Amino acid sequence: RVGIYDERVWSNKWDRPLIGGTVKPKLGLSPKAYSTIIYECLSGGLDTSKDDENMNSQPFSRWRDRFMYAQEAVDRAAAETNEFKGHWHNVTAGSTEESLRRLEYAYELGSRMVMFDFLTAGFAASADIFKRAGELDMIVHCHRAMHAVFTRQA
Amino acid sequence: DAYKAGVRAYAVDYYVPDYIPQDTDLLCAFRIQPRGVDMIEAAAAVAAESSTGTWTEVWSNQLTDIDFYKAKVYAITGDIAYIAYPLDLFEENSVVNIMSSIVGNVFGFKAVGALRLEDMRIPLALVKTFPGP
Amino acid sequence: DAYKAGVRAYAVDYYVPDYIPQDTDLLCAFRIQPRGVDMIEAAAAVAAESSTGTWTEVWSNQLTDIDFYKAKVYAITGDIAYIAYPLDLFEENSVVNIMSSIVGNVFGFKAVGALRLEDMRIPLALVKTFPGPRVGIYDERVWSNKWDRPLIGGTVKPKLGLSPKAYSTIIYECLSGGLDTSKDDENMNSQPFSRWRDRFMYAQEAVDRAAAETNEFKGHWHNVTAGSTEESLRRLEYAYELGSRMVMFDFLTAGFAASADIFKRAGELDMIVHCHRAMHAVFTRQANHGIAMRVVAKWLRLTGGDHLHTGTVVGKLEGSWNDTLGIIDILRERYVKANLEHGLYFDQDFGGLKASWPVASGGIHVHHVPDLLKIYGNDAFFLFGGGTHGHPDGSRAGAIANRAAVEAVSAGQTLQQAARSCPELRKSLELWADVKFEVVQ
Amino acid sequence: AYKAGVRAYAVDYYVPDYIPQDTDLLCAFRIQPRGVDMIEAAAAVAAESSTGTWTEVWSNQLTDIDFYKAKVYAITGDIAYIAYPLDLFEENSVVNIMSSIVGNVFGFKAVGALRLEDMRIPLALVKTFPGPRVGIYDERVWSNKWDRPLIGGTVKPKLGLSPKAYSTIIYECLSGGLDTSKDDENMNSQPFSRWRDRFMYAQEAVDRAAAETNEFKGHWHNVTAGSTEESLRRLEYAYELGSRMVMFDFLTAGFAASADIFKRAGELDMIVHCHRAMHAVFTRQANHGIAMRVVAKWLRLTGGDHLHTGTVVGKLEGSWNDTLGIIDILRERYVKANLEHGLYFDQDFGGLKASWPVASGGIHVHHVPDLLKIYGNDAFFLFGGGTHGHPDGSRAGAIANRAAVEAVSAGQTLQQAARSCPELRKSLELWADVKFEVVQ
Numbered sequence A: 001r002v003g004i005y006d007e008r009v010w011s012n013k014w015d016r017p018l019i020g021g022t023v024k025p026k027l028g029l030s031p032k033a034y035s036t037i038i039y040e041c042l043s044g045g046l047d048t049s050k051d052d053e054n055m056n057s058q059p060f061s062r063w064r065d066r067f068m069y070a071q072e073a074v075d076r077a078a079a080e081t082n083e084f085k086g087h088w089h090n091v092t093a094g095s096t097e098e099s100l101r102r103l104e105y106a107y108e109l110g111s112r113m114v115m116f117d118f119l120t121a122g123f124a125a126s127a128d129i130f131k132r133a134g135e136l137d138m139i140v141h142c143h144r145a146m147h148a149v150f151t152r153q154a
Numbered sequence B: 001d002a003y004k005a006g007v008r009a010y011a012v013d014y015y016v017p018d019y020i021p022q023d024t025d026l027l028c029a030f031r032i033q034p035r036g037v038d039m040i041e042a043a044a045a046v047a048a049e050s051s052t053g054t055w056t057e058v059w060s061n062q063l064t065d066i067d068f069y070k071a072k073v074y075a076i077t078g079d080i081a082y083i084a085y086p087l088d089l090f091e092e093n094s095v096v097n098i099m100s101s102i103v104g105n106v107f108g109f110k111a112v113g114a115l116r117l118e119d120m121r122i123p124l125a126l127v128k129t130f131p132g133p
Numbered sequence C: 001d002a003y004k005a006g007v008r009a010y011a012v013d014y015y016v017p018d019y020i021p022q023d024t025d026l027l028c029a030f031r032i033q034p035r036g037v038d039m040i041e042a043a044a045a046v047a048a049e050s051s052t053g054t055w056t057e058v059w060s061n062q063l064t065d066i067d068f069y070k071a072k073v074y075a076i077t078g079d080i081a082y083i084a085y086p087l088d089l090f091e092e093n094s095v096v097n098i099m100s101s102i103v104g105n106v107f108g109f110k111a112v113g114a115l116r117l118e119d120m121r122i123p124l125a126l127v128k129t130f131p132g133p134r135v136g137i138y139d140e141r142v143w144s145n146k147w148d149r150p151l152i153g154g155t156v157k158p159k160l161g162l163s164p165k166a167y168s169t170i171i172y173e174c175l176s177g178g179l180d181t182s183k184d185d186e187n188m189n190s191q192p193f194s195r196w197r198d199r200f201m202y203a204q205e206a207v208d209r210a211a212a213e214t215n216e217f218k219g220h221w222h223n224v225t226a227g228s229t230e231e232s233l234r235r236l237e238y239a240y241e242l243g244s245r246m247v248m249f250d251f252l253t254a255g256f257a258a259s260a261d262i263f264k265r266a267g268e269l270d271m272i273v274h275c276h277r278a279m280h281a282v283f284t285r286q287a288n289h290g291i292a293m294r295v296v297a298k299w300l301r302l303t304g305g306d307h308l309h310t311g312t313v314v315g316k317l318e319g320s321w322n323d324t325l326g327i328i329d330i331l332r333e334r335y336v337k338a339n340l341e342h343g344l345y346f347d348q349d350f351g352g353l354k355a356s357w358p359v360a361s362g363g364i365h366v367h368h369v370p371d372l373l374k375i376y377g378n379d380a381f382f383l384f385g386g387g388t389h390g391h392p393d394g395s396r397a398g399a400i401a402n403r404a405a406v407e408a409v410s411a412g413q414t415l416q417q418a419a420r421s422c423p424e425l426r427k428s429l430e431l432w433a434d435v436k437f438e439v440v441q
Numbered sequence D: 001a002y003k004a005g006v007r008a009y010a011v012d013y014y015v016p017d018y019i020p021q022d023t024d025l026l027c028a029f030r031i032q033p034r035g036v037d038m039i040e041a042a043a044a045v046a047a048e049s050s051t052g053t054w055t056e057v058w059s060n061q062l063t064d065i066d067f068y069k070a071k072v073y074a075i076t077g078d079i080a081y082i083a084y085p086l087d088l089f090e091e092n093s094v095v096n097i098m099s100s101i102v103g104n105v106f107g108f109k110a111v112g113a114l115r116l117e118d119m120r121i122p123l124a125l126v127k128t129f130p131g132p133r134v135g136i137y138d139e140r141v142w143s144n145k146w147d148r149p150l151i152g153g154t155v156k157p158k159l160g161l162s163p164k165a166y167s168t169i170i171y172e173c174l175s176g177g178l179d180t181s182k183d184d185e186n187m188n189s190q191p192f193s194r195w196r197d198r199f200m201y202a203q204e205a206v207d208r209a210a211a212e213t214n215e216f217k218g219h220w221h222n223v224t225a226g227s228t229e230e231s232l233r234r235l236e237y238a239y240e241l242g243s244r245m246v247m248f249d250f251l252t253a254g255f256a257a258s259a260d261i262f263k264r265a266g267e268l269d270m271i272v273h274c275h276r277a278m279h280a281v282f283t284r285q286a287n288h289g290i291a292m293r294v295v296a297k298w299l300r301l302t303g304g305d306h307l308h309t310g311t312v313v314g315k316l317e318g319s320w321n322d323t324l325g326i327i328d329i330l331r332e333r334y335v336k337a338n339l340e341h342g343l344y345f346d347q348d349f350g351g352l353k354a355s356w357p358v359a360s361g362g363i364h365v366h367h368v369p370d371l372l373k374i375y376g377n378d379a380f381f382l383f384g385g386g387t388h389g390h391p392d393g394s395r396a397g398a399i400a401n402r403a404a405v406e407a408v409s410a411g412q413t414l415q416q417a418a419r420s421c422p423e424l425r426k427s428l429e430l431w432a433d434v435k436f437e438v439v440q
């Protein structure tokens, strides 16, 4: 839907690589702590931040808390830098229906982008996720988790 | 100031041969072919990079209790590494989430030339969240 | 021909003192008053008629493995019967199903003159099927930016009879004056004197005004309790579209099933649900018959209430000190250890589910704050209804006093210290100095 | 007129000169005062269930407290009679009635025990409720069964049966002569019996047994579930299988969910059988709680088609004269006050349909004469153990229970009937010595 050129247009960023970063530690961070890191790293100069591929919804970080707090940080950091900022909320979930649900919430928070583990969820769910994101004018960042299980050995 | 920046071996914090697995842990049996590091180090990288860790120590590790959430290599018998994952690391009712952690990035690490997940003990408390047939 | 028709004693197959409870069993502690049969027989009937058995042997018992599915009286200590239920007996994610078996028919048996469920060990594998609270304690502190102190609220009074506009005037004054939240009375729903759309809308404008004017987060727990789950959802959604971040629900009078739909929807709508325990004393209060409140507390937290009334101890409503401490821990902690001094018969794992706010309410005033803080600490709500609107100078001044009292004690100072700088609080201290209630440990 | 501070509740809420009105909702409370005289304790109940609190609030001047307040208008010994103005109640909501009348007053330190014995729901409020969809008469019409009790039975063991085994028992007992069978109240959906399997297999059995007997047959599928939405789902599936009836644990699920379930079932032309699981937690002891008679009024108004009422003679507690009052509450248009039957007030039901009383629990063939004496024809008698506990199986047990009810219902005695029916002779022999206490 979006691709390279239109994202440069949406974000007004040209003639350089875009810079991002995964929040760490991979798991175990409260949604509020998560937002504090997202704030610090986007304010420091990152173009985007992202959930880890295995951050979905868990007892330590339920997806609605993390998404909401993360997008607050994005917007606080964008306004204070006068620069487009984004965080790739991970909508990967145990079913296509639930992934679409998480995508819809990210859209309503104002997010222009999400993250999706397209191989672990699968190409069938990916097709539906891409189609809805394109209707919601959103970027879908695709994480290739699991690929090395069959792409590694020659 | 528990924060010691820089790179350490994964085994410092992820190799715990004294760890006693609990009925709520998700257990994995991994067959490992190490490449350029110890068998213990190879196992500990698989454990770290499928739970809480990354390649260098992060200040943000002090914002949570790593020792609680981290995966633990509790046994190594030959080239089989037994790793335990706390229940809290997993989304309920989601094989997809299990995949994303256990087989998400660790099979492409340079420090392992080959990796095979042989088996997994899905704890009963996580089984009950699934519908089955 | 394993089928021996006719009546046998329940104990033949349900009294198993050698049984070793398993981590997956649901355990119950029952206080039994036998009537016309042995203590063992009484326990075995409770076990049988809440699991697999009936009054006479049925041929159909051979169609399944009774020894696997049957409940087991594995211990009897005095008049306390410990009974274990296999996990397979329960529907996942359903307190309603737990109720239907454990407290469904056994309290009306002729062979027991009195029965009281004291506690229940819900096994972790069944806990994990429940959602628990959406917001809970920590995230509500984040939403409202209120830390290191109890939060303070208060029921609008009089209970019934106030018009919607008069209600919002009281809400504005007590919020502006220092209360963090205000609430509908549990029996304010939609009545001729206050139809619910009128009350909801005026109350939320008072809320928004107070918050802007004070530069503090404020809220009002709109009561969405109604005669119908559908109607309750309609009132929750209206509260949402008004911009409310919170409502209340009489979860026991409406019912656990309804409560489940309501928590689910509130959670999708990013709203707090304050849970009022109206009706509970109909079965939680008498020590020899009924369901202990701690059990209700477990069921409420799993189902997903964000707040739960747990008593004052020192106010107008009955409640024991140590009993209240055990209920507090059940709602706030991850793992609770058995402690019979707090009425906890089993260790209870809550499996990472969010915590619920304990709520202290009913007949309390400024003088009770030191005790209430010793009981609850900071992670709780103290509600002052008459204690706010009973102030000689009105609701705003009562709020000033209560807020000044709670901030002071919570920081280490005394009501007497705080009173030096606050006249509103001196009047509250003076008015109710000799108003005390029975205190039981 | 605002005087701050604590005043006694009786100053404003003890009004022995008050004349109850036909619009007032009236309550009879049995009170055990604690640290206060009976009058103060009854005044506290009235205030804290209507307009009052523990201290005088300035906002009392913003409305008409004398108009909206409850009034303790009479005291007879340990019974306080309290009148509540109609305007205090939301229309068509038992939930609201409970919120006021039993909300908080049962936990006050100023009473050691409190029992709601009866409540007079004014006709103006009664007329806002739908009452049952089907009721007694139309069910006799739907099933073409007249001039006798209907006979049913719970499948046993309570839990642990495969859905297929379940269907085998339902087949045998309905074919043997039962009018209806039912899930146990705690059979919802479990690892041993998922609801879709059991419902589907159970309704197959119903239809096979109906066709082979040329008689209407039914099984009460239990749609009780952890949420109203899921219960509605199970109700919809039972409807699509062709079932004309379901079962619902109305108190454990709750009156809010019950209202939605009754409304959908009435749109789907289905009977809802209401199981009162949990009731004895607060209806048992005379000291404290809510009398079952009040629960019966609430259930009938909300729209339950059947309601378990006790056996008196079976394994569960229940006094004869009390059960007669509950029965009249469920079946009659106008109940007359009668303290021998525990009825403190006349109750008008405003032409709402009647609910079937349901006798169930620990009863067998020998109990049938007493049962009909208590209930007469318009009732269900339910034999669970008394059917599947037959020496020869569920079919023979149903044969016996059907013949014992048919016989007594006609005028014959058990032994007259028994001489023709050997299955009944075996039931009589097996359970001749099985008796429970009987309190009148």
Ligand SMILES: O=C(O)[C@@](O)(COP(=O)(O)O)[C@H](O)[C@H](O)COP(=O)(O)O
Pocket (backbone or CB within 6 Å): C155, C157, C185, C186, C277, C278, C309, C310, C311, C312, C317, C359, C360, C361, C362, C363, C364, C383, C384, C385, C386, C387, D048, D053, D054, D104, D107
């Ligand atoms: O109706 C009332 O009495 C209250 O509004 C208290 O008013 P005041 O503040 O004026 O007392 C609360 O609902 C009760 O505290 C409930 O009891 P509990 O908290 O025990 O459930």
Ligand SMILES: O=C(O)[C@@](O)(COP(=O)(O)O)[C@H](O)[C@H](O)COP(=O)(O)O
Pocket (backbone or CB within 6 Å): C049, C054, C055, C105, C108, D154, D156, D158, D184, D185, D276, D277, D308, D309, D310, D311, D316, D358, D359, D360, D361, D362, D363, D382, D383, D384, D385, D386
């Ligand atoms: O679970 C039971 O015990 C029953 O199936 C009886 O089975 P049996 O026929 O085998 O005894 C009924 O649900 C109870 O009678 C309900 O009690 P009540 O009608 O008093 O509410």
Ligand SMILES: [Mg+2]
Pocket (backbone or CB within 6 Å): A022, A051, A052, A053, A054
């Ligand atoms: Mg990653």
Ligand SMILES: [Mg+2]
Pocket (backbone or CB within 6 Å): C155, C184, C185, C186, C187
């Ligand atoms: Mg109240």
Ligand SMILES: [Mg+2]
Pocket (backbone or CB within 6 Å): D154, D183, D184, D185, D186
């Ligand atoms: Mg039953």
